[PDB]
Amino acid sequence: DSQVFIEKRSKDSKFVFSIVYNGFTLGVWVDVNQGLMYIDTAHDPSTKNVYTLTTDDLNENMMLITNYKNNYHLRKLASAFMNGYLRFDNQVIRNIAYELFRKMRIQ
Amino acid sequence: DSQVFIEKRSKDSKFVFSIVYNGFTLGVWVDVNQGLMYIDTAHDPSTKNVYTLTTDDLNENMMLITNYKNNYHLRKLASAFMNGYLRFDNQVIRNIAYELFRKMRIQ
């Protein structure tokens, strides 16, 4: 099933933040020189940049514009995905990221 | 009502494309040096870069990822809006752009 955006994170990529989506944690990583972002299960368990996203959406984190003040890393994620710069470690992660993205909105 | 992202287009801004949303035409313009994009009613009636967006959405142009191949200018629009780089000529235009954005999705 279309393993095109499927790349493992590069040696020089750096951790930036995590998303806990339902209860599953996804680590987001950046390769600065390449201009690519990667979503993997690996993460740093002590980071300040953590975002709880849930299917029912009580904290409104699926609302990119409602929460502009607080959600900077999510809006970048969504940009990178739309501008073609997001990479996923696995097809499973990919299917999870897709599902996450499907319930986001620009309001 | 919050006239913050309300700026008229700059002297050096250039036309890039239009969106016909329901039947109303919006011209999108870029100021390259400032890194800002503007939505106004002005447009170039002979451009090739035209995108028909409709509330019921038959052509699927509200699906940023479904139509990745064809919708490059829309994905940039949505990026600019989320990264804080979109400006609107009027509050009316703004309310229209907001409404347009509300029915878009990342699928």
UniProtKB/Swiss-Prot annotation, chains A, B:
Could you say which residues of the full protein are shown?
A: 226 to 332 of 332
Subunit organization: Homopentamer. Interacts with the packaging RNA (pRNA). Part of a DNA-gp3-gp16 complex.
In its UniProt entry, what is this protein called?
Answer: DNA packaging protein
Annotated region (DNA-binding), positions in chain? 8-107
Superkingdom of this protein's organism: Viruses
Q: What does this protein do?
A: ATPase required for the genome encapsidation reaction. Part of the active packaging motor via the binding to the packaging RNA (pRNA), itself fixed to the head-tail connector at the unique portal vertex of the prohead. Binds and supercoils the pre-formed, unit-length DNA bound to gp3 to produce an initiation complex for DNA packaging. Provides the energy to actively pump the viral DNA into the prohead. Approximately one molecule of ATP is used in the packaging of 2 bp of viral DNA.
Q: Cite the effect that the entry attributes to residue 103 to N.
A: Complete loss of packaging
Q: Which organism is it from?
A: Bacillus phage phi29 (Bacteriophage phi-29)
Domain notes for this protein: The N-terminus contains the ATPase activity and the C-terminus (CTD) binds DNA. The CTD is likely a vestigial nuclease that has lost its hydrolytic capability since Phi-29 is not a concatamer that neads cleavage.
Q: Which family does it belong to?
A: Belongs to the phi29likevirus gp16 family.
